[PDB]
Structures are given as C-alpha cells and as structure tokens.
C-alpha cells in the first residue's frame, strides 16, 4: 500500500536544453517481469539543494523520458521510482533513485522594460531602465546604441509666415490580457556597454537634435554574443540659450531709387533650423512695422528688400526664429534714406 522501495536506480544519461530535459536510467526488472506496471518520474522546481509523470514499461535497453515544459535557467529536482505489483508471495518492493539536480540551459533574455530618457543639459541624455522581467540567465551587460536623426526634409522648404504658421513647439482585465498577449507573442552606430548599472549618461551630443536610442540586455559577451530584442526610445537635447543669436550688425545699402537692401549674417549653428526672420522697424514717432522673411525669401534676395517709404530715420532690429523658440533681438541700427 505504501512505497517501501529498497533497491536502487541510477541515472546514466542526462542531456539538457533551454526548455527540455532528457533522462535515462539503468533498466530494472523484478524476478517476475509481469509485476512491473511502469515507472513514476517526480520533478519539481528546486532553487535550493535542500530538498509526477507515469512512464510505460519498456519492451522485453535503457529507458528514458523527456520533459518539455520547463523554464530556462532553473534548477529541477528529479528522481525516478518504480511501480510494482503486490504479488501473492514475498513482495518485490522495487527500486527508486536518489534525488538529482538538473539545470536547464539559457536563452535570449527578455526586452529591457521602462526606458526613460531625460535631457537635463544641452548635450547629455540621462537614460534609465529596469532589468527585464525574464532574464533567462545572468544578465552580463546592457548594449545601448544611439543614432542622430536628421530634421524633416519637408520643413526645409516651407514658407512659414503664410497662413498656417502653427509651428510645433519642439475593465482593466481586458487591457492586462491585451498586454499579456502582446508580451507573450515575443516567445557602425555609436554604442556603449553598460556593466552592472541600470542608467547611462550620454555625453558629446549636438545641441537640440533628435536622438533615437536602441537598448538591449545581454547575458553572454565573448563566446558568440547572444541576447534580446531591442527596446526603442527617443530623446531630444535641450537647446543652448544664446545659440540662436544673430551676430554682426545689420548691414544696409540704399539704391538711388530709395531701394534698401538689408544683409545680416546667418546664424551658422542654430537650434535645428531657422524657420523665419522677423524684421521690425519704426521711425521717430511712428507705429512699429513688422516684416516676415522665409528661408526661400532670404536665399533668393540675399537679405531683404525695402521700398516706397516716407522720408525719415528708421531703426532696424532683426530677430531669428528657430524650433526651440524666438532668438535675441539684434541691437537697433539707424539708417537715413535719401529724400531728394
């Protein structure tokens, strides 16, 4: 009625995989071979070494079994106990085996979760993340790639002071099951290897540019690196406050027909690009007059044109507008048109 196995079984072949285990053991046969009703294989997940499947009898060498539903990088306690029949004579108690410990191999880890990128300075991106929920091994190091994304080519050929000048200021069970299903579906760029850390500061970056950051976790470095799928994040460094200032005084030229040509140095290194130039002038006592210049306008006229104005002395201030925001107002420059 109870299990009183006295003899011993021994394992002679153990071969693991990332989620399967194949075992063999020495054959057993009681004095009456009909008494064997099969084998019983016990296995459980045993993280510490301080510690049911029914198998048909083999035909009348070494029997074996194969477990398939095992997690990777886990330790299992396994032992095999025979199943005999209480005969009409002195019972053949059968044999069982000692508890052995088998560890499954490792596989590609899971994607690192919760990546957060914050641009505290104008050239550094602080990136933080949490370790993946399914390491599938000892996570040796994280791999971070970062790539500079160029500005949209459409924004380079758009007149902005035209109408349309809105510049971009650059039931829980259902949702839980949705996200569970989508995570269960998952079974030379400048880079960095983060070792024993969950955060990294990116230094040496262009001011106010878009950066695409790809993050991976890896558990094997030298022998044919194998690791997870990437998690993608995006970031944009903060802009320099004075990088949009227009340098040099606004050069002016006057033609004989009261035609005024305005030259001003381009902001060689702006925050991304310069969308428009605003020229504001107002003479002594008049009301302020503003004028827009688009990129194409500035390229075509090498500056700006002014014509058909009343005699007087005007002061010109020019401000450049970029993606980050409005630049600094240029110091006023005074000019006097010829009044014949």
């Amino acid at each position: 009625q109870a299990s009183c196995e006295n003899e011993l079984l021994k394992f002679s072949f153990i071969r693991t995989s990332f989620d399967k285990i194949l075992l063999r053991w020495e054959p057993y046969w009681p004095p009456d071979f009909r008494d064997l009703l099969g084998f019983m294989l016990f296995y459980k997940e045993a993280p510490y070494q301080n510690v049911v499947v029914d198998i048909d009898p083999p035909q009348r060498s070494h029997p074996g079994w194969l477990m398939r539903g095992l997690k990777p990088w886990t330790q299992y306690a396994i032992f095999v106990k025979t199943l005999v029949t209480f005969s009409d004579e002195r019972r053949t108690y059968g044999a069982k085996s000692d508890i052995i410990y088998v560890q499954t191999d490792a596989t590609n880890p899971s994607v690192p979760l919760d990546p957060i990128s914050v641009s505290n300075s104008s050239s550094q991106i602080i990136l933080k993340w949490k370790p993946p929920s399914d390491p599938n091994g000892n996570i040796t190091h994280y791999l971070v790639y970062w790539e500079r994304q160029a500005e949209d080519s459409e924004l380079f050929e758009l007149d902005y002071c035209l109408k349309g000048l809105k510049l971009p200021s650059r039931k829980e069970l259902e949702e839980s099951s949705f996200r569970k299903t989508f995570e269960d579906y998952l079974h030379h760029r400048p880079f960095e290897k983060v070792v024993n850390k969950e955060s990294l500061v990116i230094s040496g970056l262009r001011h106010f540019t878009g950066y695409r950051i790809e993050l991976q976790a890896c558990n094997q470095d030298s022998p044919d690196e194998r690791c997870s799928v990437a998690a993608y994040v995006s970031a944009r460094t903060m802009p320099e406050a004075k990088a949009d200032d227009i340098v040099g005084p606004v050069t002016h030229e006057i033609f004989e027909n009261n035609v005024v040509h305005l030259m001003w140095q381009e902001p060689k290194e702006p925050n991304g690009l310069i969308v428009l130039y605003e020229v504001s002038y107002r003479r002594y006592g008049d009301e302020e007059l503003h004028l827009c210049v688009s990129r194409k306008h500035f390229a075509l006229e090498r500056g700006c044109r002014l014509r058909g104005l009343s005699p007087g002395n005007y002061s010109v201030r020019v401000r450049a507008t970029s993606l980050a925001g409005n630049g600094s107002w240029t110091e006023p420059t005074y000019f006097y048109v010829t009044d014949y």
Binding site: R15, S17, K20, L22, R24, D56, P58, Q59, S61, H62, P63, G64, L66
Partner: peptide, 18 residues
C-alpha cells in the same frame, strides 16, 4: 537535437510509431 534523439529512443525502447 533533443527531439530527434527522443524520437529515436522511443523507436528503440518503446516502439511507438516508427
């Protein structure tokens, strides 16, 4: 692979399918 080895051993000792 492990699966093919298991299939071969099932051919040998248990005889199922094969």
């Amino acid at each position: 692979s492990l699966e093919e080895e298991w299939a071969q051993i099932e051919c040998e000792v248990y005889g199922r399918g094969c």
